[PDB]
Structure formats: C-alpha cells, structure tokens
Design a binder for this molecule. Structure first.
Ligand SMILES: [Cl-]
Ligand SMILES: [Cl-]
Ligand SMILES: [Cl-]
Ligand SMILES: [Mg+2]
Ligand SMILES: [Mg+2]
Ligand code: NA
Length: 442
C-alpha cells in the first residue's frame, strides 16, 4: 500500500459539495497535481464562483456516471452515505472518504479531536487558546467556516479540530492524541433514522485509536463503545477526574481532588461553560500542554458570542445571550445548575421544528421563573407553564414586557430552544439583536 505517501496522481477523484468544505478539497487535490471533478445538488452553489476553469463541474443533481467512474469519492458531510447514489457507489466497492479523512492522512502534528452535540466550538477554541498561551503554533478548525484541510502546514505543531458526527462517519485514519465526545443529545434525527444510538455510533468513531479519551461523567453515551478503559479521563459537574466544587458562594475547578482555579478568575459563566472549560483542560493536559499556561488561558478566554454570553450586567441584572441554543438539549444545558438569586426571565421561541419540549418542564417550576415566549412556536413554549408566561410575536416585544419588571438579583436569559430562521437570518443575528436591546432596555 501507499503507506504515509498517499498519492492521488492519475486518479479520477470526484468531490461532492461546493460549500467551503468541498472547495477546500478542490484546493487540496490541485496542490497535489490532481484536477478533481466536483458536483453539487444545488443548481447554483455559491462556491461555483471560486472554482478554477479546469475543474469539471456538475450542478443541479448528483451525476451518477461520474460517481461510478471514480477511483475516489470525497463526500462533504452534508450528504448522507445513505443517499442512493452514494450507496450504489459503495456497493460497487468505490472508496468514499471525507475531508477529515484526507486531513488525517496528511497531518504531521498531533490532533486533538472534539465532537458532541453542544459545546464543540467553545471547547475547540479554548484548547486552541491554551495552546497559544504555551507559544504553540496551533491550527484550530473543522467548523464550517474553517475547513480542516486549510490548516495543513508543516509549520503547525498541534491541530485542534471540531468534528461533526457526519465527518466522523467517513473518517477511518484519525489517531487523536486526545479525543472527546462532550455529550449526546437528541439531534439530527433526519440523518439517523435508527435513533440516538445510531447518532452516537458515528461520534464513537472519534475514540478509535485515540491515545486519551476525555469522557463526560454525566453522560454515559460519551463512554467508548466497550466502556471506560485505561485511556479514559472524565469531566463532570459533581465528580470525575475534572469537576466543579461549590462552597458558600464560591466555585472552583477541581482536578484529581485538587482545586486548580477559582472561577472568579475566568471570564466565562454558566455551569455548561465551566464543564466546557474542564473538558478543554483535560484535553490540553492529555495533549501535553503545560498546565500553567492552560490555566492562564482559562483566565483570558472571553468565550464565543451567543454561548451563555453575558452581554450586560447592570443594576444587578445579568442579561445572557445563549442564542446558540437552537434545540431543546442546548437549552436544557443552560437551565441545568442555573443559579439565580432573584427571578429568571426566560426567553423561549422561534421555529421549534416540532420538537418535544417536555424535558424543559422540570426546570420551570418554583416561584422565581417567568417565561416570555415568542416566534412561530411561542404558544407551544408558553404551554409548559401558562400561569407564568407571556406570549408575543417578536423577541423585541417580549423584552419590552420583561424590562420594566426586572429587579436586582434577576437574570434575563435568551436560550430559545428553537431555530431562529422564522424571524432572523441566523442565530448570530438573533443574539446580536438581543444584545442591542439589552443595552437599550437594561
Ligand atoms: Cl459551542
Ligand atoms: Cl505538544
Ligand atoms: Cl438558527
Ligand atoms: Mg495550499
Ligand atoms: Mg410549524
Ligand atoms: Na502523506
């Protein structure tokens, strides 16, 4: 076999997808003296604009004869291996990989690999900042806006990748120095018709040939398929190798029975972000990054926008933008362990996508919760507890109802449990508008 010298010259290479990921695949092959073919089911993918002239392209459908003539099919993670054209190619013995597989074959530095339903971007970015604080030339990517292949460089000393279940499904050569599944929550049902354990099985690939597995002590679906083993290091809220310690208003990160940092030294807030910080510290430790610089990064990291982000703290009221919470599991992570001295003013709503909101109910009793429900499916959210709920069409209308009612001690939390597209371009615009209105009203 080729060994570490995968060579694609002379091969008929077919890329599916003209988003940024597929374009990064085009660039990869061109750099190696291979002109691939590309296809996309969209009639006019934006990425068409960026193709060289010599790359043959087919848009508006998949081209079956191109697939069946291929020596190698590179499938963007947005097309299911179950698509009948790809299943037909597989049944013919044609090799199907994805961008992360091509990346793993060529990477010449250790890889930290991060997947999970919620928290991937925060943990990935934070491990990256831990590496930067150590002076390491780290390459951070894998999100849709920074495809892994663009990171490849002999100057890179460490890679930190956010990986989706879809990318993992086509990846066989990953040998992570440290890997985590942060959590597994019901999500992506369309792509996993056999349910939660099928979705999990895709994520479990991340641990294959990983040197260290960083597992979530609070989520058994993050354990390796045959259970915990000698590679496993855990993070959790109450216990685990990395966990949280709370005493009389103070909270500390704790590692192997030793407090390591008072969270007042951090810029992140929220239980879920603290467990993200624990996961990141575990991954950094396992990768060999110096503990002292990793702690320093925990004190400087601002966090990403829209991830339990404090956008205003004024007159004793914390206004928190958790617009990244586009599903029930994410909002559950925001509400679990939430500390509010006064009243929680919780903003829910948008396009709920026919989700079951039942899991949120257990968090909404008690005398100190008010709901402000908006968007397409606002009525379904108010139904969780009508007596403490208001319903408006828009987020602005909801915020104008709650603003005259807040008192010192209160929290205003936008963790909507829904997609934003009924009223916003995306969840970032929703969070930015929440931030603007909090500054106007708070
Ligand atoms: Cl995230
Ligand atoms: Cl290293
Ligand atoms: Cl959204
Ligand atoms: Mg290049
Ligand atoms: Mg509907
Ligand atoms: Na190589």
């Amino acid at each position: 076999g080729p060994g570490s010298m995968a060579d694609y010259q002379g091969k008929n290479v077919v890329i599916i997808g003209l988003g940024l990921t597929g374009l990064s695949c085009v660039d990869f092959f061109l750099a190696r003296g291979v002109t691939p073919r590309v296809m996309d089911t969209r009639m006019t993918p934006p990425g068409l604009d960026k193709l060289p002239e010599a790359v043959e392209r087919h848009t508006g459908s998949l081209n079956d004869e191109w697939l069946m003539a291929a020596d190698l099919i590179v499938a963007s993670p947005g097309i299911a291996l179950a698509h009948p054209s790809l299943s037909a190619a597989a049944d013919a013995g044609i090799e199907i990989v994805g961008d992360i597989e091509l990346f793993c074959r060529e990477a010449q530095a250790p890889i930290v690999a991060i997947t999970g339903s919620n928290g991937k971007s925060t943990v990935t970015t934070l491990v990256g900042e831990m590496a930067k604080a150590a002076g390491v030339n780290v390459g951070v990517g894998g999100n849709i806006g920074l495809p892994a292949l663009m990171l490849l460089d002999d100057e890179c000393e460490l890679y930190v990748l956010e990986l989706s279940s879809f990318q993992l499904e086509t990846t066989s050569s990953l040998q992570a120095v440290a890997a985590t599944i942060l959590n597994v929550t019901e999500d992506h049902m369309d792509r996993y018709p056999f349910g939660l354990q099928q979705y999990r099985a895709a994520k479990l690939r991340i641990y294959e040939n990983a040197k260290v597995c960083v597992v979530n002590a609070d989520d058994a679906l993050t354990m390796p398929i045959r259970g915990a083993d000698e590679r496993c290091v855990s993070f959790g809220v109450n216990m685990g190798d990395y966990h949280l310690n709370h005493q009389q208003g103070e909270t500390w990160l704790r590692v192997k029975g030793e407090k390591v940092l008072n969270v007042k030294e951090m810029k992140l807030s929220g239980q879920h972000n603290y467990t993200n910080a624990l996961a990141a510290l575990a991954l950094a430790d396992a990768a060999g990054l110096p503990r002292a610089s990793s702690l320093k990064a925990l004190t400087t990291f601002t966090g990403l926008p829209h991830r339990f982000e404090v956008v205003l703290e004024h007159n004793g009221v914390r206004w928190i933008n958790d617009s990244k919470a586009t599903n029930v599991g994410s909002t559950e992570a925001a509400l679990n362990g939430l500390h509010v001295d006064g009243t929680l003013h919780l903003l829910l709503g948008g396009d709920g996508k026919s989700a079951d909101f039942s899991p949120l109910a257990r968090y909404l009793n008690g005398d100190n919760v008010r709901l402000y429900c908006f968007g397409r499916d606002g009525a379904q959210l108010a139904a969780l507890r009508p007596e403490v709920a208001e319903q408006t069409e828009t987020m602005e209308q909801a915020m104008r109802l709650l603003a005259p009612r807040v008192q010192p001690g209160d929290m205003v939390l936008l963790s909507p449990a829904c997609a934003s597209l009924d009223q916003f371009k995306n969840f970032e615009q929703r969070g930015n508008e929440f931030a603007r209105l909090a500054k106007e009203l708070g």
